[PDB]
Amino acid sequence: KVMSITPREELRRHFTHWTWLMMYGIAIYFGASIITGGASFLYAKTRLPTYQQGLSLQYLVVVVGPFMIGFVFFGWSALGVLGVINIELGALSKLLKKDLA
Amino acid sequence: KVMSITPREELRRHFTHWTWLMMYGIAIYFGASIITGGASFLYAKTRLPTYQQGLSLQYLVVVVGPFMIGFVFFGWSALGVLGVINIELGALSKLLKKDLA
Amino acid sequence: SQSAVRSRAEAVKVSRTFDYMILFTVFFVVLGGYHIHYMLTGGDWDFWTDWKDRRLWVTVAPIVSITFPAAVQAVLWWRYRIAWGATLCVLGLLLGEWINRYFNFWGWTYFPVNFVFPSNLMPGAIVLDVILMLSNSMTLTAVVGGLAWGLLFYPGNWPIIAPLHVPVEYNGMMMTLADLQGYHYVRTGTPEYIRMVEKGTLRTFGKDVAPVSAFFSGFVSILIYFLWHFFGSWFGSEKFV
Amino acid sequence: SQSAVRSRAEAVKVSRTFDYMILFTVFFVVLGGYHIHYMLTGGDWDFWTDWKDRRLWVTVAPIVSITFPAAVQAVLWWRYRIAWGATLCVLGLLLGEWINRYFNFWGWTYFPVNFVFPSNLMPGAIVLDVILMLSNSMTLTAVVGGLAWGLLFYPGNWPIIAPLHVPVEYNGMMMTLADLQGYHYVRTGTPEYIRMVEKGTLRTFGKDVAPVSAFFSGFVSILIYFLWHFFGSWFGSEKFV
Amino acid sequence: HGEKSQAAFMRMRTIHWFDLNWSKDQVSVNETMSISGKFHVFAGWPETVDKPEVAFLNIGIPGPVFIRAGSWIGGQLVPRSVSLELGETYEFKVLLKARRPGDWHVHTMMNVQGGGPIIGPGKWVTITGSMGDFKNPITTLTGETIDLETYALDGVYGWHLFWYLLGVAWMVYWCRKPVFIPRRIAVDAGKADSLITPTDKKVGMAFAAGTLAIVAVSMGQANEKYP
Numbered sequence: 001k002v003m004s005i006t007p008r009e010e011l012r013r014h015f016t017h018w019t020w021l022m023m024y025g026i027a028i029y030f031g032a033s034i035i036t037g038g039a040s041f042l043y044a045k046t047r048l049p050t051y052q053q054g055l056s057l058q059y060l061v062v063v064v065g066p067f068m069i070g071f072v073f074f075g076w077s078a079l080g081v082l083g084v085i086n087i088e089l090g091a092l093s094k095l096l097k098k099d100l101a
Numbered sequence: 102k103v104m105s106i107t108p109r110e111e112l113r114r115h116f117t118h119w120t121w122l123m124m125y126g127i128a129i130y131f132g133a134s135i136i137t138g139g140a141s142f143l144y145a146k147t148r149l150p151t152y153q154q155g156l157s158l159q160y161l162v163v164v165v166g167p168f169m170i171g172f173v174f175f176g177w178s179a180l181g182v183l184g185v186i187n188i189e190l191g192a193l194s195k196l197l198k199k200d201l202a
Numbered sequence: 203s204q205s206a207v208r209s210r211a212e213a214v215k216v217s218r219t220f221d222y223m224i225l226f227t228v229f230f231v232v233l234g235g236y237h238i239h240y241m242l243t244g245g246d247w248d249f250w251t252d253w254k255d256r257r258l259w260v261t262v263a264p265i266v267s268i269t270f271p272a273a274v275q276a277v278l279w280w281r282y283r284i285a286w287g288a289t290l291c292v293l294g295l296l297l298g299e300w301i302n303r304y305f306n307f308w309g310w311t312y313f314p315v316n317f318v319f320p321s322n323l324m325p326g327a328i329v330l331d332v333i334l335m336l337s338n339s340m341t342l343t344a345v346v347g348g349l350a351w352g353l354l355f356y357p358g359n360w361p362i363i364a365p366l367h368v369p370v371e372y373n374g375m376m377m378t379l380a381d382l383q384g385y386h387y388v389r390t391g392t393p394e395y396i397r398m399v400e401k402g403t404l405r406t407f408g409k410d411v412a413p414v415s416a417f418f419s420g421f422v423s424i425l426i427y428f429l430w431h432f433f434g435s436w437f438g439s440e441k442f443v
Numbered sequence: 444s445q446s447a448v449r450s451r452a453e454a455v456k457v458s459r460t461f462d463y464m465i466l467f468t469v470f471f472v473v474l475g476g477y478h479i480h481y482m483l484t485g486g487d488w489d490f491w492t493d494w495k496d497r498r499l500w501v502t503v504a505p506i507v508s509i510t511f512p513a514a515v516q517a518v519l520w521w522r523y524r525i526a527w528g529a530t531l532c533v534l535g536l537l538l539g540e541w542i543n544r545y546f547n548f549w550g551w552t553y554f555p556v557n558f559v560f561p562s563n564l565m566p567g568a569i570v571l572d573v574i575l576m577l578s579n580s581m582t583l584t585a586v587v588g589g590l591a592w593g594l595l596f597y598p599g600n601w602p603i604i605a606p607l608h609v610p611v612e613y614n615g616m617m618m619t620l621a622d623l624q625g626y627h628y629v630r631t632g633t634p635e636y637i638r639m640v641e642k643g644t645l646r647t648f649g650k651d652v653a654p655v656s657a658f659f660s661g662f663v664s665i666l667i668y669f670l671w672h673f674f675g676s677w678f679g680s681e682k683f684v
Numbered sequence: 685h686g687e688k689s690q691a692a693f694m695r696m697r698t699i700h701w702f703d704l705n706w707s708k709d710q711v712s713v714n715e716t717m718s719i720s721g722k723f724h725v726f727a728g729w730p731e732t733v734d735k736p737e738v739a740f741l742n743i744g745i746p747g748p749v750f751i752r753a754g755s756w757i758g759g760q761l762v763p764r765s766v767s768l769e770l771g772e773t774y775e776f777k778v779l780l781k782a783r784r785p786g787d788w789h790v791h792t793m794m795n796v797q798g799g800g801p802i803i804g805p806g807k808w809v810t811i812t813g814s815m816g817d818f819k820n821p822i823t824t825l826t827g828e829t830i831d832l833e834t835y836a837l838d839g840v841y842g843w844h845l846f847w848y849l850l851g852v853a854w855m856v857y858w859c860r861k862p863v864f865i866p867r868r869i870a871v872d873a874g875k876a877d878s879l880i881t882p883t884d885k886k887v888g889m890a891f892a893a894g895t896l897a898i899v900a901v902s903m904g905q906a907n908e909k910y911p
């Protein structure tokens with residue numbers, strides 16, 4: 001029952017989602033020098049109104065990979081982060097537009 | 102304001118359009134022995150009711166080329182002329198059907 | 203009603219000035235296209251008599267050349283019951299080839315025209331056009347036309363080249379006259395190994411090599427025809443973006 | 444209305460904590476991605492000074508590296524008028540390369556840092572970002588940017604490597620200092636023939652070889668840019684399944 | 685011309701041309717000349733030049749201003765491509781016969797498949813006369829003594845002009861009538877069968893059956909004049 005939450009709470013959670021998306025970005029960096037990729041996608045669908053009508057495409061690319069059809073594909077998959085950024089801000093933009101007029 | 106012109110004037114212009122499409126056909130022949138490819142597409146969109154809801158696909162092929170995705174593609178692109186023919190006549194056919202009953 | 207013309211007669215003069223301008227255009231534009239395509243795919247066997255063999259030339263030239271006909275037929279026949287589809291193309295090619303062999307190959311670099319004359323595609327272009335006009339069926343034109351296009355290619359050319367296939371004992375080695383032409387008229391930038399003519403196999407029987415190749419060319423030619431009809435339909439499209 | 448915040452000031456503190464967390468994320472995730480892509484396509488010329496030649500390196504490195512910029516520009520510029528698109532990427536790469544050359548190539552296997560220093564991509568990343576911010580047109584950025592990205596790659600690197608192109612009469616044979624570095628610092632698992640540097644042709648003229656390659660790289664770079672802009676737009680998509 | 689543009693080390697490290705002899709350096713149309721000499725296939729042949737397993741002894745001239753009446757390596761006629769081998773020294777002769785008056789910088793040369801043109805030294809040779817003098821006689825194994833500079837040329841011009849005009853026919857059989865706007869209207873309006881009449885319908889069968897007939901017979905008539 002978390003598609004009706006106090007706007008202050010929803011935002012507190014988009015804050016937690018980015019703690020996951022940040023830790024994930026570290027794992028991805030130590031990768032080129034998989035756990036959190038679920039810990040985050042879960043959260044965004046578990047506990048966030050914006051991601052409730054069923055899994056983001058580009059959020060998937062960021063976690064699946066070439067497993068949608070070499071390892072350069074795992075590389076190109078990182079650009080999926082633009083889709084998650086585009087969603088999150090569009091969501092945050094709507095929650096704080098007011099507010100910043 | 103040239104989607105409401107005297108049927109005699111519209112036809113006078115489809116006449117000019119084919120003066121461009123003819124000169125272009127010469128350039129294409131001296132090619133296999135780019136200017137007019139704009140001078141014509143422009144006209145058809147500038148000054149001709151038939152080409153007003155936004156650029157013909159196959160008219161584009163005739164001017165773009167492989168730049169929609171060797172040089173055999175520039176060759177296969179000439180067959181785009183069938184699309185422009187098909188449009189022009191369908192337009193002229195409607196303007197003179199009457200008239201030829 | 204309102205009229206673009208001021209007399210029934212004017213409506214017939216205009217509807218036939220357009221016939222010329224369009225004829226002119228679709229002739230030259232498709233020339234340029236068809237000629238470029240054919241120069242880069244089949245063009246190499248088409249330049250020299252000592253490339254016109256029985257294996258490769260018999261295969262390549264029909265397959266590559268049936269394309270544009272099947273494209274132009276696709277629009278002209280079904281949109282206008284126009285039945286010179288294949289022939290407008292083959293007319294355009296040969297005109298373009300011939301101007302290039304006479305005024306350039308021979309014209310400016312002195313190759314004997316009887317070394318650089320083109321292939322002859324026009325028999326198949328008539329049997330194709332007609333088989334389509336009769337029957338009015340893309341499929342029968344693909345199957346019966348495709349086989350026609352390939353099987354006719356070497357016959358339609360053998361009366362021209364056959365003179366050059368009489369053998370010769372030149373400085374100790376058997377050569378055909380075509381081979382002699384290649385040896386003689388020095389192609390500085392086209393040395394011998396570039397030439398892809400039949401050379402024999404241990405898995406092969408010699409003549410017949412030409413008929414067997416002609417049929418293979420016929421079958422692939424029907425596949426090329428299906429493909430290139432749909433490609434032509436696509437090409438004849440009045441959709442806007 | 445109801446508010447996530449309890450004061451206009453809070454709404455500005457939050458909307459700028461997010462700026463950091465997102466900056467951090469899109470910096471490191473695109474690092475990882477871009478670095479992996481670049482390591483497997485261009486990475487081999489990028490490790491060693493005696494692979495940084497005039498034919499291949501000049502060609503490969505721009506083409507492979509312009510990708511991710513064109514992807515990241517596609518989203519950041521048009522969704523947010525963000526204009527450090529190419530530079531976030533090239534910053535991320537070089538940071539990733541440099542940590543790897545210093546603490547590993549030199550760090551743990553003792554290769555002299557002046558043997559394993561990276562390519563320099565940042566001049567094109569600025570000329571690219573700016574050409575896009577001015578003009579705000581994907582096409583002009585593709586054509587004028589693509590040529591910019593390739594033509595600038597060797598100039599942006601020649602002041603660094605040129606020291607290593609002074610020749611040397613070593614044990615009887617002319618070698619550049621770069622060649623000496625390769626001969627000297629033993630790459631047990633990367634022997635000489637693996638290296639794809641220019642070697643000459645009979646159809647070729649020598650220097651100029653670098654400018655001619657740089658332009659070719661420029662042209663292919665615009666094609667790669669069109670492609671990778673659309674790929675980026677695709678990548679920046681909020682569609683749900 | 686053309687070899688000053690090639691990499692210097694290529695030309696030094698590839699084929700060495702030496703002891704060349706030119707039997708003339710002015711010649712009249714039909715007068716033959718002889719370039720002969722030796723060449724060495726340098727055993728340290730460049731990487732990016734395929735070893736000459738498949739090479740061809742050409743001459744460099746702008747078009748057949750000469751014709752190559754002969755060429756030999758090792759006293760074997762080499763009209764086809766040869767295998768040369770790194771390390772070895774070969775002798776050669778080419779028999780040029782002049783065709784087109786002018787001042788020609790004649791290069792002896794070696795095309796190496798997978799390699800490029802390996803260009804030997806050229807000396808100016810001057811042809812005098814009128815090219816219309818040029819004659820290229822051949823005695824066939826059926827003999828018959830032909831001139832290969834014009835043989836079968838009336839047959840090509842014949843048969844090509846026929847089939848072209850046969851084509852122009854088909855196109856003017858129809859462009860007699862109106863082609864585009866009226867046929868368009870006719871087809872759209874549901875009336876497409878109205879445009880192929882039964883005269884039309886097998887005027888068509890004429891051209892078809894004719895083209896096949898003219899093919900099969902002149903086919904059979906060719907395997908007679910040349911059995």
Ligand SMILES: OC[C@H]1O[C@H](O[C@H]2[C@H](O)[C@@H](O)[C@H](OCCCCCC3CCCCC3)O[C@@H]2CO)[C@H](O)[C@@H](O)[C@@H]1O
Binds near residue numbers: 012022023447
């Ligand atoms: O800063 C004051 C804010 O406090 C609350 O939100 C906090 C949250 O309670 C707070 O828990 C959270 O903190 C973000 C810390 C980010 C973790 C950083 C890294 C940890 C290690 C490496 C990766 C991530 O985000 C907000 C502040 O950034 C309120 O919800 C906000 O409205 C209020 O403005």
Ligand SMILES: OC[C@H]1O[C@H](O[C@H]2[C@H](O)[C@@H](O)[C@H](OCCCCCC3CCCCC3)O[C@@H]2CO)[C@H](O)[C@@H](O)[C@@H]1O
Binds near residue numbers: 123124206207212216
């Ligand atoms: O022929 C009489 C007609 O005059 C007017 O249209 C003219 C136009 O005023 C006239 O300017 C134009 O002329 C077409 C000439 C075609 C140019 C031919 C080539 C020039 C050089 C090489 C390429 C093209 O087309 C029409 C005649 O074909 C009227 O509009 C017509 O209704 C009327 O029937």
Ligand SMILES: OC[C@H]1O[C@H](O[C@H]2[C@H](O)[C@@H](O)[C@H](OCCCCCC3CCCCC3)O[C@@H]2CO)[C@H](O)[C@@H](O)[C@@H]1O
Binds near residue numbers: 855856859860861
């Ligand atoms: O002479 C009397 C006839 O002339 C007029 O029609 C002419 C037309 O006015 C006349 O212009 C037309 O010409 C046909 C050939 C013109 C294009 C020739 C080819 C160019 C090369 C390749 C194919 C087409 O032929 C028709 C009949 O021969 C009348 O309109 C006809 O009704 C009448 O039957």
Ligand SMILES: [Cu+2]
Binds near residue numbers: 790806
């Ligand atoms: Cu010379």
